Amino acid sequence: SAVQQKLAALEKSSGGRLGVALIDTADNTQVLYRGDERFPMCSTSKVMAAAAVLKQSETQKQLLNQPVEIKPADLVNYNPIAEKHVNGTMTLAELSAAALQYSDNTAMNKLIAQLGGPGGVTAFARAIGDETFRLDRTEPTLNTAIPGDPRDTTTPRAMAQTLRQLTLGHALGETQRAQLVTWLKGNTTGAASIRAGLPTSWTVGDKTGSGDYGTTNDIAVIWPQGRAPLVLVTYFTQPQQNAESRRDVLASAARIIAEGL
């Protein structure tokens, strides 16, 4: 298709590997480019972890309000919120918000620990019907993004379907789904990625990620003006380990997708 040829041309000009999955829930149509290839999720895996903790809160009514100790040794490579609360506490709701909206890696590690380790996030993924997602490590090593390494990867198709079930479907209870969507809509890191390729009037909730090998990711629920929502996953990774981020490529893929709508 024209969309397929253009995403292939974008990828070719990018010097890396691009994966895109669109679901149009007005009619459930799909656009896929490398939709079944694995990509390192990096920080976009945080969505799953927050959703898994949200799922826990459905049978632990007071869980999201429960204090967690932030200790000096807990800080990792990017802790814009957690570093403010060292030698203090954050609630799991606060940690979820920090992980999703500011991409705080200490907060992500607290979410992971609340689920019993990376395998608890993977187990939640399996429990909501996602067979492809795997989380294997904590922050920051889940971002190594090594080519051919299946750890901490998913496919665009699997992630699009999962994000749809989490934000628009019924993988979560109604309050938890609304809370997840509220968190995603208040993301602070997304304006250069999918959001930039979409018309300004469209509402986006998203989670960005980045890692080694110039890995540049975004996963978004999109509410276009006057139409049913879209789910759009754009993963991008590059051949050299120290490569620079390329959020403009995610914006370009989103712009190509918007024109095909």
Which residues contact ligand NXL (rule: CB under 6 A)? 42-43, 77-78, 103, 105, 140, 143, 189, 208-211
DSSP 113: H
Distance (Å, whole) CA 229 – CA 152: 27
Closest by Cα among 57, 49, 33, 86 to 176: 57
Task: Tell me whether residue 201 is one of the annotated catalytic residues.
Answer: no
Tell me the closest approach of the beta carbon of residue 99 to ligand NXL, in angstroms: 9
Tell me the closest approach of the beta carbon of residue 150 to ligand NXL, in angstroms: 18
40: number of CA atoms within 13 Å, CB side? 26
E-only strand ranges, the chain:
17-24, 29-33, 39-40, 67-70, 88-91, 153-154, 203-211, 215-223, 230-237
Q: Sort strands 67-70 and 88-91 into parallel, antiparallel or unpaired.
A: antiparallel
Nearer to ligand NXL, 6 or 110 (CB): 110
Tell me the closest approach of the beta carbon of residue 246 to ligand NXL, in angstroms: 11
Q: What kind and span of H or E run contains 189?
A: none
Q: Sort strands 203-211 and 88-91 into parallel, antiparallel or unpaired.
A: unpaired
Nearer to ligand NXL, 33 or 213 (CB): 213
Tell me the closest approach of the beta carbon of residue 80 to ligand NXL, in angstroms: 9
Distance (Å, whole) CA 83 – CA 179: 24
Q: Which residues are part of a known binding site? A: 139, 143
Chain residue at closest Cβ approach to ligand NXL: 43
Three-state DSSP at 91 gives strand
Residue appearing with tokens 């049978």: 59
Q: Which position among 14, 43, 210, 252 bears the catalytic label?
A: 43
Structure tokens at 208: 């960005």
Q: Which residues are part of a known binding site for Zn(2+)? A: 139, 143
**Active-site residue numbers?**
43
